């Protein structure tokens, strides 16, 4: 939830965090989710601020209005982001990785945003089971399986949670073909 507050004169729609503090001269104009649930990408903070400004009034930002008096001129409004960014996973795990026994698969992720302390934790699901076993050790952004065997195949998932609790997730399937035992 991102709380937007808009000012009448400087046309500054400060997009603060949910538990923020509306600055002087600005009035609360609404609240929207940046990581929109049904469409995570393809939507940007700029889109959230617009729809909130499509219900206000040009005469006065409070006392909401509509199309003939709404604030549609997005060119004049300046969006001064003062809130934490998304935990965008720039490079996610490969969807499927193919290897032979004795090989080595180095799974990687790069995270940008959130609060300063980023926590990395990995998880492993058995190749036919349904419960997610917790990978011991790890606690890093790159898992390296060496001399991988036919027992270590399956689905490996990493979950990057920050100091706030906005976790982004990514999964990878590791199919290591081998002669049957």
């Amino acid at each position: 939830e991102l709380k937007v507050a808009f000012n009448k004169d400087t046309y500054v729609a400060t997009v603060l965090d949910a538990s923020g503090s509306v600055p002087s001269g600005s009035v609360n104009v609404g609240t929207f989710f940046h990581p929109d649930e049904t469409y995570p990408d393809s939507y940007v903070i700029y889109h959230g601020v617009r729809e909130l400004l499509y219900k206000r009034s040009e005469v006065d930002p409070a006392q909401p209005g509509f199309w003939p008096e709404n604030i549609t001129n997005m060119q004049a409004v300046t969006i001064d982001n003062k809130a934490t960014a998304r935990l965008v996973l720039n490079t996610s795990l490969p969807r499927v990785v193919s290897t032979i026994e004795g090989g080595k698969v180095t799974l990687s992720v790069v995270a940008l945003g959130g609060k300063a302390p980023l926590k990395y934790k990995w998880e492993f699901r058995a190749p036919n089971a349904s419960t997610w076993t917790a990978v011991s050790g790890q606690t890093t952004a790159n898992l390296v399986l060496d001399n991988i065997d036919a027992d270590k195949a399956g689905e490996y998932k990493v979950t990057v949670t920050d100091a706030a609790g906005t976790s982004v997730d990514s999964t990878a399937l590791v199919a290591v073909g081998a002669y049957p035992p």
């Binding site: 490969p94 969807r95 032979i100 073909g177 049957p180």
Partner: protein, 100 residues
């Protein structure tokens, strides 16, 4: 191509003599079944070449059979783009007639 999607896929085809060619269709030179699908793989050792080397006889039956293996790759396209703005006076009453 449009209307296809946002990700691509291909077919890597491993050669017969490669250690990735992991298959069960394999008959040794004596006509018995063997675990390895290929002939000898990527090995160099001359012993393991002179053995498992496909040798036929005068009456050749199902005494040499090999398998194959197919892999795949993928890659998705991402949208990129930036822009800039200019006013009419910035092009008319400007020193350069080629600023645009």
């Amino acid at each position: 191509p449009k209307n296809m999607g946002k990700t691509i896929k291909v077919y890597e085809y491993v050669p017969l003599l490669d250690d990735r060619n992991i298959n069960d269709q394999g008959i040794d030179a004596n006509g018995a079944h063997i675990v390895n699908g290929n002939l000898y793989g990527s090995s160099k050792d001359i012993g393991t070449i002179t053995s498992k080397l496909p040798l036929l006889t005068e009456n050749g039956g199902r005494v040499n059979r090999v398998g194959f293996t197919r892999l795949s790759r993928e890659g998705s396209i991402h949208k990129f783009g930036f822009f800039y703005e200019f006013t009419q006076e910035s092009l008319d009453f400007d020193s350069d007639d080629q600023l645009k």
